[PDB]
Amino acid sequence: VPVTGPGEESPLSCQQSELWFLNQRAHLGSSYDNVQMAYRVIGPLDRQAYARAFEGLVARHAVLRTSYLRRGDTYVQKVNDTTGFAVAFEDVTGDSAVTEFLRAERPRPFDPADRHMLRVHILTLTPYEHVAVVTRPWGIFDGWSTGVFIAELNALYQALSRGDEPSLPELPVQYADFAHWQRRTFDADARARQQAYWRAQLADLPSCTALRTDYRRPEAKSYQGSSVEVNVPAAVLDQLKRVSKERGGTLYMTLLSAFATLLGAHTDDRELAIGSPVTNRPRPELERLVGYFINVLVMRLDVRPEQAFDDLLAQAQRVTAAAHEHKEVPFADLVRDLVPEPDPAYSPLFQVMFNLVPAVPGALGFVPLPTDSGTAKFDLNLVVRETPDGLRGYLEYSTDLYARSTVRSMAATYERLLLKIVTQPGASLARLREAAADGGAG
Amino acid sequence: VPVTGPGEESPLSCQQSELWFLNQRAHLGSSYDNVQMAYRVIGPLDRQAYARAFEGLVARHAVLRTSYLRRGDTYVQKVNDTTGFAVAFEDVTGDSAVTEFLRAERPRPFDPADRHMLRVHILTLTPYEHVAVVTRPWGIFDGWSTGVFIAELNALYQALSRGDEPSLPELPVQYADFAHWQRRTFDADARARQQAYWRAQLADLPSCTALRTDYRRPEAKSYQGSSVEVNVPAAVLDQLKRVSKERGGTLYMTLLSAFATLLGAHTDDRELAIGSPVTNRPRPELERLVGYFINVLVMRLDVRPEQAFDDLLAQAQRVTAAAHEHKEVPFADLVRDLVPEPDPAYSPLFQVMFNLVPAVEADPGALGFVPLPTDSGTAKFDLNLVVRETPDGLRGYLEYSTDLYARSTVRSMAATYERLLLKIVTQPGASLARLREAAADGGAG
Amino acid sequence: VPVTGPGEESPLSCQQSELWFLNQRAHLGSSYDNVQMAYRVIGPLDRQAYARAFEGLVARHAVLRTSYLRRGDTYVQKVNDTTGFAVAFEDVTGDSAVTEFLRAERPRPFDPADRHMLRVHILTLTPYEHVAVVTRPWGIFDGWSTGVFIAELNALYQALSRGDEPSLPELPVQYADFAHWQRRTFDADARARQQAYWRAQLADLPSCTALRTDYRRPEAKSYQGSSVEVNVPAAVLDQLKRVSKERGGTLYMTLLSAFATLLGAHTDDRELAIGSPVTNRPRPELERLVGYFINVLVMRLDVRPEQAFDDLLAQAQRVTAAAHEHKEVPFADLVRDLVPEPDPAYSPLFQVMFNLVPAVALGFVPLPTDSGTAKFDLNLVVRETPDGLRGYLEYSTDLYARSTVRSMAATYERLLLKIVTQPGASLARLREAAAD
């Protein structure tokens, strides 16, 4: 129930603890992690209608028009009005101008005192070719909100291109409403409970996994990265679904177990810590809001190589079930508590990350543009998503520690490990790794 | 209508002029064109039922059990009974072992007098992983026959795994009946007319296209090569279909015009010759038969760079419509008549080929099928673009001769083709030079 | 003595009975058996001088410019001049490009009427890195001639690069003179005697060795294969050379006995036939020529498991000594006279081969080209080197997986140790000891 008005300074929610200005780094800059979306629109596009669809979308969701101000040693959020938001138009000559503009437009800084938190550009190449650029600061909204945003934008464009009017269901809940409702159902007792659980769980855990890289770890992190591409056939994915369903688990647990099995080849550690972002939407009134509902949990797994994959699956199921009950406390709290002195040479509390993204006549075609920022916050980052023709995704690595060929071999090993898990229903981790290694020179 | 009795010799069809033993090469071997088809089976497979499904496939299609006997200075085809065919079983440990076994199995020779024209291997890895291998000589059946083969194989296996009896459509006619009908439905006047048309159409054309290559052309072709992949997004494919249907043509003409536009950047020739295999199944009955129904036609296009792409599209539509009217005479006869002595350095009458493959059209304990790569390492032409249309866009590969090209040049060619399709979509009235310049914003490859 | 004039036609030698076009296979191709020879040249290389070195090398050796003409039911050889030969230059960027170019270049055909029997390519990678490629058909010259070829090429390049004059030993005779002399000596009586000896020696022998294979033997050989490496330390090689000396034998006999001991674990037969190429240059004048002097002889050994290794070594002594007295008759004639109707499933008269080859600014790094070809079931080729024994075990991919062949190679390397330590043990005892 709405408890906010104009000019109200409302407290930040639990998930706004890492927006963009609370994670400053001296050697990187203040805007190194701006999130940019680039698309190519193919077909006869009405520029004015499409821009007015963006304006209506910004006026609909209140997060895109929210500001923040410093209040002593903490920060607060403030809601502005939609006046002053305009879609910029530029004429470009070819793809070289487009890529130069994309490269020179993302790193321009956002400010907490800025009144609109969205920048929209429409680049016109020909009357049948347009590029839409959406860039926003970190911590504004997540991938689920990105899908909602894109679907709503498509609906608004289809409605508004003609003489019609925007016709969408209203949003009874604003983000500040969710913040207040969460904050009143959140006390020192629950915070202390979850911090105690996570300090007990992350006990006696090495500060950095013994990942045998290619190049010796630098004394300081440069935060430069790249990515290799991952593909899994649809038949293998269907068999993985069948395997997971009859074992009592889910697909995420199976893929996390496979990732843990892969990383056992690059380290001799008995325990492995992998970070994993989860969504926090515990209410039927929150599947349409555009906002940041992502909290990172750390998963600990036992990767002894003489055990069966079934035992690893059961352990991963138990760990995942336990972790989902204590996902309220922010990760930054755990970083501050359990890591007093962070070493600039590696990330705190984990160095690898696994992320399963949720699925989800005059027409227009949309081809996403390649957006490779070159940033890698951790040593490794496997982001995969379910698709009708199998599993698609990529593996992001820090360029200081690994060579491209080794990361390619790792991705191929993951793809072969999934098949070997499917086809060998009783093998051990070492047996599965040996079976996957027979790739025919890769 | 069926006009052949059991154990009757029948004449060869026009498309059977390209089998494998009528086109031998001294330094290459008789089995250098063997076609191998390997795929992986995931799930609980009944090996014996699958072998019986293969045997039923062999017993159902009489091309798979047809011999070729020499009568005078020509050949005739005889159909045998299915007895003698068997599936071979091997236990294989690993995937590199599978690759070595596949490389060893493919070049094994086939004989024209052999009673069956098929080899089937089932390789057991685990009780839930098998590899099925099918090998045949060239000229036995084509890709549409491969689709029919796979579909009826799956149907037979579903019928046989449980204690049922197969329910498959009865085949109206045999391939020998088709050959007899084709022999009756011409009195050598149509053949002479098609000779005349193709002799007039291909006249005054250079013997070899003046393509620019990385390496110098040897005095004798080696017939080795590899390929690089081609990928086009589904949105671009849909917009290409929209444009092609607006212009009144088909998608094949648009893709062929795009290929002709790409090739004009690597040659100073004003006019190109591109060969393309086409299907000739001119009755409803033959549409489900397993056999060879393919002929190759040479496409002659004018690629002057100052013309609009619409003019090239119209010319391609005209040429393609004209070529499909004279597609019954074999390409080998054209080579014999127009190229009395062929230069061993290059292939006759064309050196680049374009092929658009027709598109291929849920139990709880079902089986998964994953195709396995088959890198034959062969190259019959300088360049060979093979693409097929899929629900997720356009898939294919660009095959090239390793006597002439490095891999980076062919990668650049494929990327330029993929960019050219998009630039064709987004720029209606641009010329060929403008299209090439717009597509050239790809970072030098 | 030279008995050949310009433009004279000479008869074919006995060793020329297996060139490449007298042994064609229909399904394989005429050029499936070409020999490709690639090296890497590191340092500042004068390319024109090195090509001129190749031209002078082709002019020096008359086998490289010899044609073969059909006169009746047989062939004759004619020597041409050095005009028409040239080195081909290419700019290549990368190593995968070099590999692909090498794979493309080898299978190009050779014709018997060609004036030159070589193809030389110089691939420029950088102005300080080059790749030299030499390709020839089968039956032109052997490994001894390859060593002579390389040494003389290097000498010519060293002489020509620094503006000097070439100084090479004069060739006393030419290969056609050797063929003329051979026709005079081995005419009608030695042929009959050797044919009778080989008919008596290879009688009552199984058609095919009953080896145990991973896969079922196909109805027709495909001639595809691979290989695995074989490595032996120098101390072991020295001990083997010593233990051969105490018996009066040589290293070849000891290695052949060890190879036969290895094969007895995979076969239940009491008799083995092993083929082995043999050098035949029975004159001082023939030691420096470039040509083909190789013949294949069949060695028949008894491998009963209760005998000691000493008895097998003595039997190898006897058999090897007896075979070298009858090495003039070609192997093809023996196959024709002994195997009238060959079986396409296997090779004639033997299926396993053992080949021991004799031992041998800019830096040179060879580029190993694996052809993927196998003419027999198994083929052990070992080279003697200062650091030990180097070579490979080539196997047919129709019959064997790689793991079995690697296990065989490791067992052979261990069996050499077991032979060195205790030569008095039986064959079964050494087999059990070496299986660990």
PDB file of C-alpha atoms in Angstrom, chain C residues 312-416:
ATOM      1  CA  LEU C 312      65.600 -67.192 -30.496  1.00  0.00           C
ATOM      2  CA  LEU C 313      68.636 -64.933 -30.925  1.00  0.00           C
ATOM      3  CA  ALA C 314      70.612 -67.765 -32.542  1.00  0.00           C
ATOM      4  CA  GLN C 315      67.682 -68.577 -34.834  1.00  0.00           C
ATOM      5  CA  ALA C 316      67.500 -64.905 -35.822  1.00  0.00           C
ATOM      6  CA  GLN C 317      71.236 -65.067 -36.560  1.00  0.00           C
ATOM      7  CA  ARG C 318      70.736 -68.057 -38.860  1.00  0.00           C
ATOM      8  CA  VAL C 319      67.638 -66.712 -40.627  1.00  0.00           C
ATOM      9  CA  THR C 320      69.062 -63.222 -41.181  1.00  0.00           C
ATOM     10  CA  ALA C 321      72.341 -64.646 -42.493  1.00  0.00           C
ATOM     11  CA  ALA C 322      70.502 -66.989 -44.869  1.00  0.00           C
ATOM     12  CA  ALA C 323      68.185 -64.260 -46.182  1.00  0.00           C
ATOM     13  CA  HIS C 324      71.004 -61.862 -47.133  1.00  0.00           C
ATOM     14  CA  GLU C 325      72.429 -64.448 -49.548  1.00  0.00           C
ATOM     15  CA  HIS C 326      69.211 -64.395 -51.625  1.00  0.00           C
ATOM     16  CA  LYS C 327      68.205 -60.718 -51.641  1.00  0.00           C
ATOM     17  CA  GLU C 328      68.488 -60.173 -55.410  1.00  0.00           C
ATOM     18  CA  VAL C 329      65.076 -61.479 -56.528  1.00  0.00           C
ATOM     19  CA  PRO C 330      62.347 -58.816 -56.171  1.00  0.00           C
ATOM     20  CA  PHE C 331      59.592 -59.276 -53.610  1.00  0.00           C
ATOM     21  CA  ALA C 332      56.937 -58.668 -56.284  1.00  0.00           C
ATOM     22  CA  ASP C 333      58.155 -61.682 -58.268  1.00  0.00           C
ATOM     23  CA  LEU C 334      57.969 -63.787 -55.101  1.00  0.00           C
ATOM     24  CA  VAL C 335      54.397 -62.609 -54.493  1.00  0.00           C
ATOM     25  CA  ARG C 336      53.405 -63.374 -58.089  1.00  0.00           C
ATOM     26  CA  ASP C 337      54.962 -66.849 -58.033  1.00  0.00           C
ATOM     27  CA  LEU C 338      53.751 -67.748 -54.514  1.00  0.00           C
ATOM     28  CA  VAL C 339      50.373 -65.989 -54.158  1.00  0.00           C
ATOM     29  CA  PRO C 340      48.450 -66.382 -57.445  1.00  0.00           C
ATOM     30  CA  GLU C 341      45.090 -65.044 -56.177  1.00  0.00           C
ATOM     31  CA  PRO C 342      45.633 -62.408 -53.470  1.00  0.00           C
ATOM     32  CA  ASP C 343      43.032 -61.710 -50.806  1.00  0.00           C
ATOM     33  CA  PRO C 344      41.988 -58.027 -50.582  1.00  0.00           C
ATOM     34  CA  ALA C 345      41.510 -58.430 -46.810  1.00  0.00           C
ATOM     35  CA  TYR C 346      45.235 -58.515 -45.960  1.00  0.00           C
ATOM     36  CA  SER C 347      48.704 -58.056 -47.431  1.00  0.00           C
ATOM     37  CA  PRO C 348      50.595 -60.926 -49.093  1.00  0.00           C
ATOM     38  CA  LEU C 349      53.155 -63.182 -47.411  1.00  0.00           C
ATOM     39  CA  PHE C 350      53.400 -61.094 -44.211  1.00  0.00           C
ATOM     40  CA  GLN C 351      51.312 -58.623 -42.206  1.00  0.00           C
ATOM     41  CA  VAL C 352      53.865 -57.154 -39.756  1.00  0.00           C
ATOM     42  CA  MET C 353      57.058 -55.296 -40.672  1.00  0.00           C
ATOM     43  CA  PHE C 354      60.180 -54.373 -38.699  1.00  0.00           C
ATOM     44  CA  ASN C 355      62.446 -51.660 -40.120  1.00  0.00           C
ATOM     45  CA  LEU C 356      65.724 -50.607 -38.490  1.00  0.00           C
ATOM     46  CA  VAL C 357      67.320 -47.781 -40.481  1.00  0.00           C
ATOM     47  CA  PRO C 358      71.021 -46.895 -40.093  1.00  0.00           C
ATOM     48  CA  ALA C 359      72.073 -43.870 -38.087  1.00  0.00           C
ATOM     49  CA  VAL C 360      72.807 -40.518 -39.712  1.00  0.00           C
ATOM     50  CA  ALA C 361      74.466 -20.179 -39.692  1.00  0.00           C
ATOM     51  CA  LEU C 362      71.044 -21.710 -40.323  1.00  0.00           C
ATOM     52  CA  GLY C 363      69.099 -24.017 -38.023  1.00  0.00           C
ATOM     53  CA  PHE C 364      66.869 -26.766 -39.395  1.00  0.00           C
ATOM     54  CA  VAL C 365      63.735 -28.136 -37.717  1.00  0.00           C
ATOM     55  CA  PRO C 366      61.894 -30.985 -39.488  1.00  0.00           C
ATOM     56  CA  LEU C 367      58.129 -30.773 -39.890  1.00  0.00           C
ATOM     57  CA  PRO C 368      56.636 -34.246 -39.281  1.00  0.00           C
ATOM     58  CA  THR C 369      54.038 -35.079 -41.937  1.00  0.00           C
ATOM     59  CA  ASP C 370      51.907 -38.072 -40.922  1.00  0.00           C
ATOM     60  CA  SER C 371      50.269 -39.460 -44.059  1.00  0.00           C
ATOM     61  CA  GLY C 372      47.721 -41.614 -42.226  1.00  0.00           C
ATOM     62  CA  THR C 373      48.587 -44.626 -44.396  1.00  0.00           C
ATOM     63  CA  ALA C 374      49.158 -48.251 -43.383  1.00  0.00           C
ATOM     64  CA  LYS C 375      50.175 -50.995 -45.810  1.00  0.00           C
ATOM     65  CA  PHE C 376      50.367 -53.690 -43.101  1.00  0.00           C
ATOM     66  CA  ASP C 377      48.717 -54.483 -39.777  1.00  0.00           C
ATOM     67  CA  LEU C 378      51.711 -53.269 -37.743  1.00  0.00           C
ATOM     68  CA  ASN C 379      54.962 -51.576 -38.754  1.00  0.00           C
ATOM     69  CA  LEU C 380      57.798 -50.854 -36.309  1.00  0.00           C
ATOM     70  CA  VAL C 381      60.336 -48.283 -37.534  1.00  0.00           C
ATOM     71  CA  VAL C 382      63.231 -47.443 -35.199  1.00  0.00           C
ATOM     72  CA  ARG C 383      66.191 -45.106 -35.740  1.00  0.00           C
ATOM     73  CA  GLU C 384      69.486 -45.272 -33.861  1.00  0.00           C
ATOM     74  CA  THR C 385      70.419 -41.882 -32.398  1.00  0.00           C
ATOM     75  CA  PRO C 386      73.197 -40.726 -30.047  1.00  0.00           C
ATOM     76  CA  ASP C 387      70.630 -40.188 -27.269  1.00  0.00           C
ATOM     77  CA  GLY C 388      69.042 -43.627 -27.710  1.00  0.00           C
ATOM     78  CA  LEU C 389      66.465 -45.373 -29.902  1.00  0.00           C
ATOM     79  CA  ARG C 390      63.809 -43.248 -31.610  1.00  0.00           C
ATOM     80  CA  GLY C 391      60.922 -44.262 -33.832  1.00  0.00           C
ATOM     81  CA  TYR C 392      57.241 -45.139 -34.039  1.00  0.00           C
ATOM     82  CA  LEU C 393      54.836 -48.072 -34.239  1.00  0.00           C
ATOM     83  CA  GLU C 394      52.486 -47.716 -37.210  1.00  0.00           C
ATOM     84  CA  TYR C 395      49.200 -49.617 -37.040  1.00  0.00           C
ATOM     85  CA  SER C 396      46.094 -50.189 -39.134  1.00  0.00           C
ATOM     86  CA  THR C 397      43.070 -48.234 -37.914  1.00  0.00           C
ATOM     87  CA  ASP C 398      40.772 -50.935 -39.320  1.00  0.00           C
ATOM     88  CA  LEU C 399      41.986 -53.358 -36.629  1.00  0.00           C
ATOM     89  CA  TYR C 400      43.327 -51.451 -33.616  1.00  0.00           C
ATOM     90  CA  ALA C 401      42.506 -48.620 -31.265  1.00  0.00           C
ATOM     91  CA  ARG C 402      45.262 -46.264 -30.137  1.00  0.00           C
ATOM     92  CA  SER C 403      45.300 -47.525 -26.533  1.00  0.00           C
ATOM     93  CA  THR C 404      46.212 -51.086 -27.541  1.00  0.00           C
ATOM     94  CA  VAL C 405      49.098 -49.870 -29.705  1.00  0.00           C
ATOM     95  CA  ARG C 406      50.377 -47.565 -26.955  1.00  0.00           C
ATOM     96  CA  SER C 407      50.265 -50.520 -24.560  1.00  0.00           C
ATOM     97  CA  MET C 408      52.208 -52.597 -27.097  1.00  0.00           C
ATOM     98  CA  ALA C 409      54.870 -49.887 -27.434  1.00  0.00           C
ATOM     99  CA  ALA C 410      55.264 -49.546 -23.660  1.00  0.00           C
ATOM    100  CA  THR C 411      55.488 -53.331 -23.296  1.00  0.00           C
ATOM    101  CA  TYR C 412      58.192 -53.408 -25.982  1.00  0.00           C
ATOM    102  CA  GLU C 413      60.185 -50.713 -24.180  1.00  0.00           C
ATOM    103  CA  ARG C 414      59.920 -52.658 -20.912  1.00  0.00           C
ATOM    104  CA  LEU C 415      60.798 -55.932 -22.658  1.00  0.00           C
ATOM    105  CA  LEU C 416      64.049 -54.394 -23.870  1.00  0.00           C
TER     106      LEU C 416
END
